[PDB]
Amino acid sequence: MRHISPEELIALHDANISRDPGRAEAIIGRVQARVAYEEITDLFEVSATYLVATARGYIFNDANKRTALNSALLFLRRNGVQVFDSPELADLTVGAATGEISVSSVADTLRRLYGSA
Amino acid sequence: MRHISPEELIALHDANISRYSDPGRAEAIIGRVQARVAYEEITDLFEVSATYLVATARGYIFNDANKRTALNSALLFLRRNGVQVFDSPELADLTVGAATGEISVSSVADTLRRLYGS
Structure with a gap:
């Protein structure tokens, strides 16, 4: 079978950008x-x-991921939970966005990091 | 519970859009x-x-550049390998559902096989 190259993919994208x-x-x-x-x-x-x-x-993409992460963290802030940046959060967002990590696993990760005893 | 208001959400989005x-x-x-x-x-x-x-x-x-690229790539690969391809109504909901895991790979393949295959 014949595959597509990265250069061809970048080129599909540039062309689409012209919207x-x-x-x-x-x-x-x-x-x-x-x-x-x-x-x-x-x-x-x-x-x-x-x-x-x-x-x-x-x-x-980056803008989508950060908006999604930020809305989750903002909601917790507003409800009196202390939040901080943690290296787990980047992979957590794409995982959850895509369906690899179920909503319950995300909640459990967030609870582990920021949560009470 | 205190919920996010639309205004705070639009502001998170614009800040992120203005950034990247x-x-x-x-x-x-x-x-x-x-x-x-x-x-x-x-x-x-x-x-x-x-x-x-x-x-x-x-x-x-x-419905922008990023959505279209995903679909171009799937369809270019089919064209490259002897499969004739055309626009169909199923395809827009196919991409989003593919991205979000709501539609599985195999179901995606099944929809393309049914539209384009012999």
């Missing part, structure tokens, strides 16, 4: 990795792997 | 959260906080 690289390098590598390692052989399953990987990495 | 938006978006997000908390009987600050996180990410998903 990295970095991110694109990582997406294609992620995609090519899963296809090899998990023996994904049919075209539509591979196509679907591209949509999912590309959707996740472009749609849940 | 239409008011009703923010109301929808806040309403999706208030429903889940009054429905599912949620008293735990942390579960409400986690709901905000997921509901604000899912967003805030715009």
